[PDB]
Amino acid sequence: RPNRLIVDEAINEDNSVVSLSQPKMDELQLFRGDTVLLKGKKRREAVCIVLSDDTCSDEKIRMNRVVRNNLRVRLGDVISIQPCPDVKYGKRIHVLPIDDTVEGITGNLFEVYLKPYFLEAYRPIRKGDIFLVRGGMRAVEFKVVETDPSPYCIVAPDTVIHCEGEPIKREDEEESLNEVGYDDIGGCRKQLAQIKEMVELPLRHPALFKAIGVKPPRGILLYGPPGTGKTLIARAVANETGAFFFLINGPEIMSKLAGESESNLRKAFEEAEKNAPAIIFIDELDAIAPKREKTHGEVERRIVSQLLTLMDGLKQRAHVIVMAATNRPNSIDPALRRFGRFDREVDIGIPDATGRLEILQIHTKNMKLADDVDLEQVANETHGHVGADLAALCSEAALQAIRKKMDLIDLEDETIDAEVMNSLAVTMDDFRWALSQSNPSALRETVVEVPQVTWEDIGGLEDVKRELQELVQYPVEHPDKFLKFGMTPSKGVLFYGPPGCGKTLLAKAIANECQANFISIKGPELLTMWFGESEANVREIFDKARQAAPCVLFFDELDSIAKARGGNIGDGGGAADRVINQILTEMDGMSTKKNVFIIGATNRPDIIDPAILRPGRLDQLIYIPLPDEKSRVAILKANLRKSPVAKDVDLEFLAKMTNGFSGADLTEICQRACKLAIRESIESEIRRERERQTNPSAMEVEEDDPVPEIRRDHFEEAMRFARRSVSDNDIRKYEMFAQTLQQ
Amino acid sequence: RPNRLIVDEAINEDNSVVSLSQPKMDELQLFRGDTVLLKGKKRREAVCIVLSDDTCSDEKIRMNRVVRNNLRVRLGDVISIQPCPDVKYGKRIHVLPIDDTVEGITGNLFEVYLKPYFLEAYRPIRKGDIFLVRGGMRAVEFKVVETDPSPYCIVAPDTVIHCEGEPIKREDEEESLNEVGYDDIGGCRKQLAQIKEMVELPLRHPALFKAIGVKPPRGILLYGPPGTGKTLIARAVANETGAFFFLINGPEIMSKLAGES
Amino acid sequence: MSDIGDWFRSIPAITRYWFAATVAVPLVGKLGLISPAYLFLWPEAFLYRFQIWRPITATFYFPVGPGTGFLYLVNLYFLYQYSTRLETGAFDGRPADYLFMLLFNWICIVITGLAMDMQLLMIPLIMSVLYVWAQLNRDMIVSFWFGTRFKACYLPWVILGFNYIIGGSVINELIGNLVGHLYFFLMFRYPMDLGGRNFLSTPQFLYRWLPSRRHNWGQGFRLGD
Ligand SMILES: Nc1ncnc2c1ncn2[C@@H]1O[C@H](COP(=O)(O)OP(=O)(O)OP(=O)(O)O)[C@@H](O)[C@H]1O
Ligand SMILES: Nc1ncnc2c1ncn2[C@@H]1O[C@H](COP(=O)(O)OP(=O)(O)OP(=O)(O)O)[C@@H](O)[C@H]1O
Numbered sequence A: 001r002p003n004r005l006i007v008d009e010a011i012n013e014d015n016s017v018v019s020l021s022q023p024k025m026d027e028l029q030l031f032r033g034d035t036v037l038l039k040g041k042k043r044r045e046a047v048c049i050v051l052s053d054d055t056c057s058d059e060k061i062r063m064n065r066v067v068r069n070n071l072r073v074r075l076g077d078v079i080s081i082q083p084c085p086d087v088k089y090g091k092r093i094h095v096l097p098i099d100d101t102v103e104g105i106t107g108n109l110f111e112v113y114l115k116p117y118f119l120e121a122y123r124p125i126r127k128g129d130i131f132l133v134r135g136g137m138r139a140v141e142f143k144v145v146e147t148d149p150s151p152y153c154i155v156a157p158d159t160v161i162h163c164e165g166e167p168i169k170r171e172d173e174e175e176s177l178n179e180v181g182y183d184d185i186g187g188c189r190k191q192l193a194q195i196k197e198m199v200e201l202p203l204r205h206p207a208l209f210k211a212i213g214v215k216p217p218r219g220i221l222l223y224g225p226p227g228t229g230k231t232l233i234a235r236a237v238a239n240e241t242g243a244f245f246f247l248i249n250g251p252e253i254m255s256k257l258a259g260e261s262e263s264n265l266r267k268a269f270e271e272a273e274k275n276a277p278a279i280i281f282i283d284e285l286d287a288i289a290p291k292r293e294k295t296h297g298e299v300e301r302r303i304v305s306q307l308l309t310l311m312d313g314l315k316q317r318a319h320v321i322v323m324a325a326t327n328r329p330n331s332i333d334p335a336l337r338r339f340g341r342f343d344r345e346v347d348i349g350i351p352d353a354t355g356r357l358e359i360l361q362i363h364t365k366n367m368k369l370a371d372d373v374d375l376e377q378v379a380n381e382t383h384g385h386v387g388a389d390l391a392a393l394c395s396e397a398a399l400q401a402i403r404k405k406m407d408l409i410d411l412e413d414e415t416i417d418a419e420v421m422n423s424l425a426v427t428m429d430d431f432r433w434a435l436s437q438s439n440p441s442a443l444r445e446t447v448v449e450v451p452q453v454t455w456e457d458i459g460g461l462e463d464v465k466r467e468l469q470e471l472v473q474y475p476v477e478h479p480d481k482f483l484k485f486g487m488t489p490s491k492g493v494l495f496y497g498p499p500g501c502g503k504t505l506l507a508k509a510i511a512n513e514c515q516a517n518f519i520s521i522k523g524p525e526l527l528t529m530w531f532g533e534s535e536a537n538v539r540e541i542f543d544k545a546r547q548a549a550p551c552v553l554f555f556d557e558l559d560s561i562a563k564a565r566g567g568n569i570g571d572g573g574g575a576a577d578r579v580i581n582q583i584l585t586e587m588d589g590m591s592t593k594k595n596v597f598i599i600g601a602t603n604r605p606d607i608i609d610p611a612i613l614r615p616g617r618l619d620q621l622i623y624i625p626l627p628d629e630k631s632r633v634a635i636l637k638a639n640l641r642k643s644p645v646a647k648d649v650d651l652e653f654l655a656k657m658t659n660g661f662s663g664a665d666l667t668e669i670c671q672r673a674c675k676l677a678i679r680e681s682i683e684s685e686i687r688r689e690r691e692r693q694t695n696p697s698a699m700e701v702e703e704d705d706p707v708p709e710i711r712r713d714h715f716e717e718a719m720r721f722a723r724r725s726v727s728d729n730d731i732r733k734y735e736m737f738a739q740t741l742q743q
Numbered sequence B: 001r002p003n004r005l006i007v008d009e010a011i012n013e014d015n016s017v018v019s020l021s022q023p024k025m026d027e028l029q030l031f032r033g034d035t036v037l038l039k040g041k042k043r044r045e046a047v048c049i050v051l052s053d054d055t056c057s058d059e060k061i062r063m064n065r066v067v068r069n070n071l072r073v074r075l076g077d078v079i080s081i082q083p084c085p086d087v088k089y090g091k092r093i094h095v096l097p098i099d100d101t102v103e104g105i106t107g108n109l110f111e112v113y114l115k116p117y118f119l120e121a122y123r124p125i126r127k128g129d130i131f132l133v134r135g136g137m138r139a140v141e142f143k144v145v146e147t148d149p150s151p152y153c154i155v156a157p158d159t160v161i162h163c164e165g166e167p168i169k170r171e172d173e174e175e176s177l178n179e180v181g182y183d184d185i186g187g188c189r190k191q192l193a194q195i196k197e198m199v200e201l202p203l204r205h206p207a208l209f210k211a212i213g214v215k216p217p218r219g220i221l222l223y224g225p226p227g228t229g230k231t232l233i234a235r236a237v238a239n240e241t242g243a244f245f246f247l248i249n250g251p252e253i254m255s256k257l258a259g260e261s
Numbered sequence C: 001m002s003d004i005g006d007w008f009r010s011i012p013a014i015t016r017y018w019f020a021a022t023v024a025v026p027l028v029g030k031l032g033l034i035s036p037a038y039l040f041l042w043p044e045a046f047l048y049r050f051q052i053w054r055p056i057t058a059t060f061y062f063p064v065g066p067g068t069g070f071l072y073l074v075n076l077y078f079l080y081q082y083s084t085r086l087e088t089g090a091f092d093g094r095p096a097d098y099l100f101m102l103l104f105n106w107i108c109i110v111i112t113g114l115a116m117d118m119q120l121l122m123i124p125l126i127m128s129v130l131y132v133w134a135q136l137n138r139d140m141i142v143s144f145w146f147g148t149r150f151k152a153c154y155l156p157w158v159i160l161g162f163n164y165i166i167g168g169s170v171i172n173e174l175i176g177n178l179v180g181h182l183y184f185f186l187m188f189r190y191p192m193d194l195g196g197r198n199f200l201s202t203p204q205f206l207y208r209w210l211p212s213r214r215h216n217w218g219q220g221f222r223l224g225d
């Protein structure tokens, strides 16, 4: 039937148009600019404009939030679309905005909003429709309550508006339709996708699902840093799906009145059960249900057990879903981890630079910034921040710009607001000052992501790269050969060789190439974890790696354990042995299903305990030879990007003079040369300033700053300190150890 | 309109200074030491002496606490300054000390306080004003309740001063002095400026930033050694900016019996 | 509580006069010069014998006396929380149609009272319009300030017993119920199915004042393109 068409999100940003695929326009006989009467629920009829967009599938009609509000429907609904081009030019429209816009403005929406929005717009208008216009800061809503002719009219020169009168309140159900939606979230594609996938079907078709006879999931927990928008996520999902979201705060529950809390708790549970499929949200469960041995009194135990009983007694019953928010899964009582109880857990990681840019773009929407905004490096430098931090930064920058406008000598009591709001811009100095007044909350916390180092970045030992990619990419991409032949692929590979050879560089490069998550573990942190906090840290780090499959776990200072094992300390040996035993047991505990690889690196392989070098354990071992000439020239040309390239000389003879030197030596030499170049530029600029101040207008001819020519003299003053970073005899010791292995 | 001036914090602590830049002196062609008329909120009237200060901007007037209270206004407001050259030398002044300002003195107010402060000052005074005088080790307020001519007049050598009688009953909106101010804090200029910058705007303009719709901060922590003046800082800010300071103490809460706390 | 004062003061002049008369007929009738016994509403008496004293005055009879005056109080109390809802509920945006529908319903109820020979008229009308109003407001719990144990499905017969214990001839209220049913018929069933003659007429007196009936769109602004 060419009537119904299921709805979908719109990619077009225009309010009064929708995206149509070519076969649908051909079948319905509609063209560009033709008005169509979408008939939905509640006897709601809307006039929209057809646009050509084959991106949308035939069965799905792209349709954004404003049209959804006008049609009074949700996603996945059914709406009949039919031709209806008989709209007539209008004469008058009496329109009243939302009442929640005169909050200290008292302006005229006709010029500030209506003129920018409807300049040569030719939008179609119907009685009672709801739309939005973004302004300086407020996305002001507007409802037309009278039109002539009724109900169809189009934006046209022959239009007179009656925008006079106290603005009406929001239209009942639309009160919550002011904000909160899927568009309001950034950097959470996978998590949101999972949540939608496993929540939509039970909620959209509860009766159908119950008639099928499949149990619905009931335990969903989310853990992450505070301020990551977990409550925002829950609210958005509940608002989108359609339910009776009933927030329950944490702290107040304990301190209401002695032991009356469970009364209110069960009252809330009952009324939620009384009010159709609803989502019941609980926050900071640790404040309610901490670890059992943390508990001091008894009333908290009573509350915890009451909650257990209440949530366990809701098996089937109604289509009510429990939403839980917390920070750390460990702090919660494990008793709330059984099946039927909370069973599905989601981590909310810190967004990356792209996620930070997305969040800023979401926040930086109403305000009109100046035409200099460069959010890219701003996001890059602002790692370690959350959505709350970026929102605070945006608000602070807005206030700084406001005060940079200065209080322009007025008693600003609804007198200058309209003039200021429509005339604003945001300077980069505002963002600089915000960066100065910035206190990231994450700071000292691990981050898992895909590194950036590429193969060409290394420039050397392509044989090792070939072997690594052979051992890594082939099994996951070609499991058919392995199952046909029947061998278990290796899981751990060790690296040994002279220090300063970029073993971590290779690890990052292979992780980036594999497009998998990366985790770095530092030896000092391990040695800190030796005393006391060892077991839980190992368990949580391996679990975090496991849930992020596929990923490449990495280790550093793998010989530090043995370095402290034998020496003049003799203190952490028991703790070290415990840690290494835990690591060995847990890595023995992994299942081959999880496509997570492990990489260990060291420069003193002899001192390593043989138990690590065992089947199942780290068995594949790779030596890293020192760079030489081709490798030296390659690393030189890979590190020599900079802005001041000058014209340089032959890299081959530079490698020749520095034979038997690691890449660290070359990098240090380059940095020292750059330091001398900076010193020369600084002293020359200072001398030029001195001759300007002693001789006014001495250099009236506009000559640029001294050229950043890093000349061979700079190279000479660089490799004056031609460092023999690596010892000589130890190279023979390492190759002798390798040959001892090379039986 | 370079005649209305926005009042702000001042530098000179003298009781009869309004600080104007030299272009402002050129604008009105005023003399130095002449009396000028000040009009402000609460339909108050003041008479003061113009002094030179290049630190203030052209639109800025710098003027201390005593005359600012004489107009019953705080910093950040707008006042009107006009020439008042028609002032003439006073004849008699009857003042009356405040009730809670002269306790434990038992002395001749003429030869300790009135004579030095009023000497070679020529401070114009208007009926209803209050002026503070430094003494031996205390500072005492006096309210000029009668003067010739009334209400505005010039303190002159040919003035007989009468300060005898029952102390005047305390007023209500007089904004009594001897309270803590910004000057009363030393050694913390940097932090004082930091806190002033990000607290004054929301309080002074409760609706302006609401119209901007930018969330203000709600909680600020101050930490350091005890007795360093944190309570002093809070009280001074509340007194200066103008607010409804409400102090609550933890031990008071702990003293109660649980629930009522 | 004593929030009725704001409700009364806020009312405009014409509507406040209407409701003041509607509620103050008994206190006016208690002037003391004329006994309430002279308004017993005997249609047979006026039809057959002279009964000059009850031309239309018998249609607004409410006995209130020394022992009922305090109860009189709570009576008007009900009317308050009646009118406040009744004006807001059902018909709220039709001031002229308000008077029209009151007039037609009063004609119907006075006709059916002419059929009978009972005594009270305004209480049956009030309860009739009450039930026809609440039939569109069923299945709703409302509790006032000083009440926390208000149960369900008890109010109508409790009030019935309240008016039963003080007085008699209960069945009269049923006739009031009757017109409400007809009035219910008059928004859900009358003007689409029967198609017969209409006994109601709307005089031009209503259209002469037209109390609010505001529909102008203030003023308009030239747009252009
Ligand atoms: N993903 C996000 N997208 C946009 N804004 C966000 C996001 N996360 C946080 N914010 C900002 O922070 C506010 C919500 O932060 P909030 O502190 O409520 O985080 P939460 O994770 O929901 O819970 P909690 O209050 O326990 O930290 C939002 O109104 C917005 O300003
Ligand atoms: N900069 C200052 N200028 C003047 N007086 C000061 C200064 N710093 C401290 N004082 C004096 O030190 C004392 C501090 O008083 P108060 O107890 O109110 O301060 P605090 O630092 O807020 O105290 P608390 O120990 O309760 O935190 C007062 O007598 C005050 O006059």
Ligand SMILES: Nc1ncnc2c1ncn2[C@@H]1O[C@H](COP(=O)(O)OP(=O)(O)O)[C@@H](O)[C@H]1O
Binding pocket: A457, A458, A459, A460, A498, A499, A500, A501, A502, A503, A504, A505, A635, A638, A639, A662, A663, A664, A665, A667
């Ligand atoms: N493009 C590159 N190719 C090879 N090695 C590099 C490159 N860039 C940096 N390096 C090396 O990476 C090393 C990092 O040193 P460090 O992390 O201390 O020990 P390790 O080299 O064992 O990781 C530096 O010594 C540097 O020589």
